[PDB]
Motif scaffolding. Structure first.
Motif, mmCIF file in Angstrom:
data_model
loop_
_atom_site.group_PDB
_atom_site.id
_atom_site.type_symbol
_atom_site.label_atom_id
_atom_site.label_comp_id
_atom_site.label_asym_id
_atom_site.label_seq_id
_atom_site.Cartn_x
_atom_site.Cartn_y
_atom_site.Cartn_z
ATOM 1 N N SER A 69 0.853 -1.190 0.000
ATOM 2 C CA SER A 69 0.000 0.000 0.000
ATOM 3 C C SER A 69 0.889 1.240 0.000
ATOM 4 O O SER A 69 1.095 1.905 1.016
ATOM 5 C CB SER A 69 -0.945 -0.019 1.195
ATOM 6 O OG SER A 69 -0.226 -0.161 2.408
ATOM 7 N N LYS A 70 1.427 1.552 -1.178
ATOM 8 C CA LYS A 70 2.297 2.706 -1.351
ATOM 9 C C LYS A 70 2.027 3.353 -2.700
ATOM 10 O O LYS A 70 1.567 2.698 -3.639
ATOM 11 C CB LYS A 70 3.779 2.317 -1.246
ATOM 12 C CG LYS A 70 4.285 2.165 0.178
ATOM 13 C CD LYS A 70 5.757 1.787 0.199
ATOM 14 C CE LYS A 70 6.284 1.697 1.621
ATOM 15 N NZ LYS A 70 7.720 1.306 1.656
ATOM 16 N N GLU A 71 2.318 4.647 -2.787
ATOM 17 C CA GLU A 71 2.181 5.364 -4.042
ATOM 18 C C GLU A 71 3.382 5.089 -4.942
ATOM 19 O O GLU A 71 4.464 4.715 -4.484
ATOM 20 C CB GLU A 71 2.038 6.864 -3.796
ATOM 21 C CG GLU A 71 0.655 7.280 -3.333
ATOM 22 C CD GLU A 71 0.421 6.982 -1.867
ATOM 23 O OE1 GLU A 71 1.412 6.778 -1.136
ATOM 24 O OE2 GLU A 71 -0.753 6.950 -1.445
ATOM 25 N N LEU A 72 3.179 5.288 -6.240
ATOM 26 C CA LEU A 72 4.182 4.959 -7.242
ATOM 27 C C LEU A 72 4.478 6.177 -8.103
ATOM 28 O O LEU A 72 3.555 6.836 -8.588
ATOM 29 C CB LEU A 72 3.720 3.795 -8.122
ATOM 30 C CG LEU A 72 3.479 2.434 -7.466
ATOM 31 C CD1 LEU A 72 4.515 2.160 -6.386
ATOM 32 C CD2 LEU A 72 2.064 2.328 -6.907
ATOM 33 N N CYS A 73 5.764 6.466 -8.288
ATOM 34 C CA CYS A 73 6.211 7.492 -9.221
ATOM 35 C C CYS A 73 7.526 7.033 -9.828
ATOM 36 O O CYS A 73 8.420 6.592 -9.101
ATOM 37 C CB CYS A 73 6.385 8.845 -8.524
ATOM 38 S SG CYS A 73 4.842 9.692 -8.128
ATOM 39 N N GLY A 74 7.644 7.132 -11.144
ATOM 40 C CA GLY A 74 8.841 6.669 -11.823
ATOM 41 C C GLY A 74 9.073 7.425 -13.109
ATOM 42 O O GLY A 74 8.130 7.898 -13.750
ATOM 43 N N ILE A 75 10.342 7.533 -13.490
ATOM 44 C CA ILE A 75 10.755 8.240 -14.695
ATOM 45 C C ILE A 75 11.716 7.349 -15.466
ATOM 46 O O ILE A 75 12.474 6.578 -14.869
ATOM 47 C CB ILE A 75 11.417 9.594 -14.356
ATOM 48 C CG1 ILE A 75 10.476 10.448 -13.512
ATOM 49 C CG2 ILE A 75 11.782 10.348 -15.620
ATOM 50 C CD1 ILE A 75 10.999 11.832 -13.235
ATOM 51 N N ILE A 76 11.677 7.441 -16.792
ATOM 52 C CA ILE A 76 12.579 6.701 -17.666
ATOM 53 C C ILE A 76 13.286 7.695 -18.572
ATOM 54 O O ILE A 76 12.634 8.502 -19.241
ATOM 55 C CB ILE A 76 11.823 5.647 -18.492
ATOM 56 C CG1 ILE A 76 11.388 4.489 -17.597
ATOM 57 C CG2 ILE A 76 12.679 5.147 -19.635
ATOM 58 C CD1 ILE A 76 10.330 3.613 -18.215
ATOM 59 N N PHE A 77 14.617 7.636 -18.593
ATOM 60 C CA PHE A 77 15.434 8.566 -19.360
ATOM 61 C C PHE A 77 15.941 7.890 -20.623
ATOM 62 O O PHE A 77 16.535 6.811 -20.558
ATOM 63 C CB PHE A 77 16.613 9.069 -18.531
ATOM 64 C CG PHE A 77 16.245 10.108 -17.517
ATOM 65 C CD1 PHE A 77 15.998 11.410 -17.903
ATOM 66 C CD2 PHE A 77 16.160 9.785 -16.177
ATOM 67 C CE1 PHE A 77 15.661 12.366 -16.975
ATOM 68 C CE2 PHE A 77 15.825 10.739 -15.245
ATOM 69 C CZ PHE A 77 15.576 12.031 -15.644
ATOM 70 N N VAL A 78 15.712 8.530 -21.769
ATOM 71 C CA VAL A 78 16.109 8.003 -23.065
ATOM 72 C C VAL A 78 16.908 9.076 -23.790
ATOM 73 O O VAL A 78 16.855 10.257 -23.447
ATOM 74 C CB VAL A 78 14.896 7.563 -23.910
ATOM 75 C CG1 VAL A 78 15.327 6.630 -25.013
ATOM 76 C CG2 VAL A 78 13.852 6.898 -23.037
ATOM 77 N N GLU A 79 17.666 8.652 -24.801
ATOM 78 C CA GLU A 79 18.532 9.568 -25.531
ATOM 79 C C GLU A 79 17.816 10.249 -26.692
ATOM 80 O O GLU A 79 17.780 11.480 -26.760
ATOM 81 C CB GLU A 79 19.765 8.831 -26.051
ATOM 82 C CG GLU A 79 20.942 9.743 -26.328
ATOM 83 C CD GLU A 79 21.680 9.374 -27.595
ATOM 84 O OE1 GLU A 79 22.024 8.185 -27.759
ATOM 85 O OE2 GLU A 79 21.918 10.272 -28.429
ATOM 86 N N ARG A 80 17.253 9.475 -27.608
ATOM 87 C CA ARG A 80 16.561 10.033 -28.758
ATOM 88 C C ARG A 80 15.099 10.311 -28.419
ATOM 89 O O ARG A 80 14.636 10.068 -27.303
ATOM 90 C CB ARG A 80 16.657 9.088 -29.951
ATOM 91 C CG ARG A 80 18.054 8.955 -30.502
ATOM 92 C CD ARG A 80 18.039 8.352 -31.888
ATOM 93 N NE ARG A 80 19.388 8.083 -32.364
ATOM 94 C CZ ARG A 80 19.768 8.183 -33.631
ATOM 95 N NH1 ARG A 80 18.920 8.535 -34.581
ATOM 96 N NH2 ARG A 80 21.033 7.924 -33.950
#
Ligand SMILES: Nc1ncnc2c1ncn2[C@@H]1O[C@H](COP(=O)(O)OP(=O)(O)O)[C@@H](O)[C@H]1O
Length: 641
Positions: free
Chosen positions: A360-371
């Motif tokens: 029971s937790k909130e979710l936040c995520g980011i993905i870093f790409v080049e192009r």
RNA sequence: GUCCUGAUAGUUAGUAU
RNA sequence: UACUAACUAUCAGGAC
């Protein structure tokens, strides 16, 4: 509500900064903005007073348009002073001296971009003698010919009693690749340019305990790309035959087809790269999109490339028949649909993000790409996969953000962003209803984003600053930092990581007291190869070698002509070698017929074509002002009907 | 929604000394 | 180490 009670290290930093010029170095979340606001509040007794007899005002500078609103809002909230905002959209170009004077009299604190401040300084509206405090945001950009550096040239020539206090904020002093033995040279150069000191907290352990105690944990994950399936090798053979026949056509090429054949070459290479990195489904999507976008381009083109498009459609037909044949037996086969790298990314997502979703937790995520194409395709694939009401993928909502103002001279790129849509997407992300975001290195710095539990480096960082910033993005409790690396480059990346660790250790070592720069260190400022043009002495407007071509182009643009023709000036070059044994470049210039001056103009012989162009532009500015096309303030004549 | 001009960072080839 | 020519990512200022 703000933390009314300052922390002891904040008070110590404020006391240190009140005395001399200093540059503050701290990690994100330490509260450098609060220190700047407090320092502005302390010196508030010099601000009040009329501007018509020698009053003073405080200035603030930033790099990007959205930061103006953030900093103005923070200042307006924390303290009660009149604040103004100015950017390049209000048409501040057309204002006169009286409007500027009214604005200066009305306000007490100003926030504008650097270019506007430089334009004000150059044209003689402010003499830098009425500034009580000037603040640099992200001060590590002051290198070479950046506007920050060009502003300091005016500071160089002032007297002792007129000099305003200077403060700067930064997170990483270095801004490019640097072996561990050049850090001192870079630091000394930066300190010499800004004429200040680099200091940090004397209680950095307390700062780490209070805030940086959420420091992320680094994990390195490896993958192998030599695991192609039968579909992969079949498609690879198909492209091999296609490139073989393309090479045959190139052997049988002629005029007006070599460029076209090279375009086919680059298209085929892009298709191969996409298939290798992502998989078959993305290749199918990209081929379909290419067909649908070239559908509009069929008009007014040669027949040979129509035949080439027909053979491309033939390979489309055979590959889609093959894909349907396997799909009749695949039944959404995850392993065959995607490349090994995407499989590893999916495994990581299951391992961490889905496991957190179980709790029971909130979710936040980011993905870093080049192009950028990669970001778009990844978002498409993740949305498609989550749409199937999978048990493990029913809670993942994805969006993507790409850099605005980044319009190229081509490659419309299938709904480019280039607008205010970044604000809408970021508002979505802050509000909620979005747990995963795909970003092409645009939210790295200087934007307010919420705390993230997981950050994924789909691509490797390229220098120290990028690594540090991306690491600092994650600030939630039990956050994790993940880097994905191919198998054969592990040793090289390990060496680079060791270098980065050494640089960070030296930077922390710098915490001890440092000797102030001498006057000769400031005198080590380099001088441009030609002096500026001051028509009215030292206190008048000036024209510099680095601000001539843009002014010439602006004057040419404002000419009355057809709206369908810009009629920009044209340039030529002549090369010659002299006894100095270094090839000499001499430029030349010509004006459009609309302007009253019709005569070739030649600059000085310069080592590089850049400098020859600058010299020619400066000479043209001289000749224009002498005739009378520019007013008393060296602006284009604003005659109107 | 088009059409120009500047600034910073990474890679490739040729060429000094 | 300076020069010449291509590719990738980011930002700012003026025209229609
Ligand atoms: N006196 C204080 N001590 C520590 N933190 C504070 C204090 N006052 C406010 N803060 C918090 O610290 C944060 C600093 O934000 P920001 O300026 O973005 O970080 P940084 O200065 O590291 O860039 C603010 O969001 C604010 O909530």
């Amino acid at each position: 509500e703000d933390e009314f009670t300052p922390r002891p290290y904040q008070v110590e930093l404020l006391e240190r900064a009140m005395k001399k010029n200093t540059i503050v170095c701290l990690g994100t979340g330490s509260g450098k903005t609060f220190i700047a606001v407090m320092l502005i509040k302390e010196l508030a007794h010099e601000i009040r007073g009329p501007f018509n007899e020698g009053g003073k005002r405080t200035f603030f500078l930033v790099n990007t348009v959205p930061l103006v609103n953030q900093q103005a809002k923070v200042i307006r909230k924390h303290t009660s002073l009149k604040v103004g905002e100015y950017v390049g959209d209000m048409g501040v170009d057309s204002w006169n001296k009286e409007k500027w004077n009214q604005e200066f009299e009305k306000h007490q604190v100003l926030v504008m971009t650097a270019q506007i401040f430089l334009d004000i300084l150059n044209h003689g509206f402010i003499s830098l003698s009425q500034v009580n405090l000037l603040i640099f945001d992200e001060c590590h950009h002051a290198v070479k010919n950046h506007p920050y550096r060009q502003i300091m040239r005016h500071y160089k020539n002032l007297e002792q009693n007129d000099r305003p206090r200077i403060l700067g904020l930064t997170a990483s002093v270095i801004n490019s690749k640097c072996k561990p033995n050049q850090v001192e040279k870079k630091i000394k150069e930066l300190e010499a340019t800004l004429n200040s000191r680099v200091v940090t907290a004397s209680d950095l352990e307390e700062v780490a305990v209070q805030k940086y105690a959420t420091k992320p944990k680094e994990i390195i994950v490896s993958y192998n790309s030599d695991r192609k399936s039968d579909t992969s090798e079949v498609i690879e053979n198909i492209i091999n035959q296609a490139l073989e026949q393309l090479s045959n056509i190139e052997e049988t090429s002629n005029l007006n087809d070599t460029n076209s054949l090279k375009q086919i070459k680059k298209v085929l290479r892009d298709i191969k790269n996409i298939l290798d990195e992502l998989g078959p489904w993305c290749a199918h999507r990209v081929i379909k999109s290419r067909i649908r976008q070239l559908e509009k381009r069929e008009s007014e083109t040669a027949e040979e490339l129509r035949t080439i498009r027909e053979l491309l459609q033939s390979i489309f037909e055979q590959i889609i028949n093959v894909l349907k044949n396997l799909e009749k037996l695949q039944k959404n086969n995850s392993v065959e649909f995607v490349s090994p790298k995407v499989k590893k990314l999916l495994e990581i997502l299951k391992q961490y993000f889905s496991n957190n979703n179980n709790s029971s937790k909130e979710l936040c995520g980011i993905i870093f790409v080049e192009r950028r194409y990669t970001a778009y395709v990844l978002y498409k694939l993740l949305n498609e996969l989550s749409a199937k009401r999978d048990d493990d993928f029913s809670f993942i909502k994805c969006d993507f953000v790409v850099g605005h103002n980044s319009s190229p001279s081509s490659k419309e790129k299938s709904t480019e962003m280039n607008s205010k849509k970044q604000k809408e997407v970021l508002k979505k992300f802050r509000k909620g209803e979005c747990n995963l975001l795909v970003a092409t290195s645009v939210v790295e710095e200087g934007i307010d984003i919420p705390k993230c539990n997981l950050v994924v480096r789909f691509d490797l960082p390229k220098n120290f600053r990028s690594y540090v910033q991306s690491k600092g993005r994650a600030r939630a409790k039990n956050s994790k930092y993940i880097i994905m690396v191919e198998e054969d480059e592990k040793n090289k990346f390990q060496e680079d990581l060791n270098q980065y660790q050494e640089i960070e250790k030296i930077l922390l070592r710098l915490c001890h007291n440092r000797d102030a720069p001498s006057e000769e260190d400031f005198d080590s400022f380099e001088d441009e190869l030609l002096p500026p043009y001051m028509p009215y002495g030292t206190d008048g407007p000036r024209v510099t070698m680095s601000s001539a071509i843009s002014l010439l182009h602006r004057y040419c643009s404002k000419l009355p002509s057809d709206r369908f023709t810009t009629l920009t000036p044209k340039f030529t070059y002549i090369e010659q070698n002299n006894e100095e044994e270094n090839k000499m470049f001499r430029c030349t210039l010509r004006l459009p017929i609309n302007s009253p001056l019709r005569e070739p103009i030649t600059g000085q012989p310069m080592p590089s074509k850049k400098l020859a162009k600058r010299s020619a532009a400066l000479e043209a500015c001289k000749k224009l002002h002498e005739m009378g096309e520019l007013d008393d303030h060296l602006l284009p004549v604003k005659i109107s009907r």
